[PDB]
């Protein structure tokens with residue numbers, strides 16, 4: 001049964017609620033982004049209207065084979081009427097095609113559902129600026145002050161400089177980047193661009209990337225592994241065993257691997273500056289864990305909410321424990337008292 005925090009009161013609408021069977025009273029199912037915990041349950045046999053972004057709709061059609069007649073893509077930043085209710089989709093600064101949804105209820109209540117997001121001050125000048133929000137359904141993934149990480153731009157700078165140094169010292173080094181879903185494409189695209197290479201990958205991953213409307217993509221990616229010195233592999237293969245095995249396959253073209261694991265936050269964030277990050281090394285293989293996040297830090301989350309001033313907050317992440325819930329409610333009250341709403 002569908003939980004309360006996936007239902008939008010006063011509507012026929014649910015958000016990211018595909019794993020519950022037919023939800024009683026739901027006339028339209030919204031999907032915020034193409035990540036598995038959110039799309040869980042969709043397939044080619046789904047027969048209810050799905051509302052999402054163009055990019056999310058490309059992935060639904062090509063990867064999950066959802067039939068075209070049930071896919072309803074909406075443009076961003078545009079007032080649209082769905083089953084008699086005004087909605088707007090906003091960029092969520094998460095993975096490609098990820099959105100926030102603004103719902104303008106018939107009784108005058110305004111609701112913002114963030115989906116998954118990385119809050120940014122640029123959101124303070126979207127169509128959110130123009131009106132009041134009564135209820136906020138919030139991505140609270142990192143809602144605790146120990147969760148700090150750098151900007152995405154500093155992390156990319158670290159990775160570009162790292163890769164460029166290694167390969168200029170040894171032109172026979174291979175770079176490998178881990179992946180297990182969409183998002184974080186800047187990591188491997190920025191590295192390949194500094195090295196003057198395309199990024200090589202499996203047919204299944206190339207297909208996924210072809211759905212993302214990324215400009216000039218045919219210039220950046222390829223299925224010909226032999227022609228590329230930046231390879232993508234499944235995240236589970238980013239370990240000494242998996243990389244040794246991969247090095248075997250390259251036919252003595254390479255004699256060293258430098259590999260990157262983009263993670264979210266890890267406890268080495270509580271001690272180490274991005275500048276000071278070092279790899280784990282075994283022989284001719286090194287592995288860097290880099291803190292490339294597509295969710296708000298605690299400070300970024302706080303700034304957004306204190307700007308928005310919602311009347312009520314409903315968390316969508318970390319909802320399963322009482323300790324989590326009590327922690328989050330404490331921070332929301334702090335934020336409200338400090339800012340004065």
Ligand code: NI
Pocket residue numbers: 033035094116
């Ligand atoms: Ni996500």
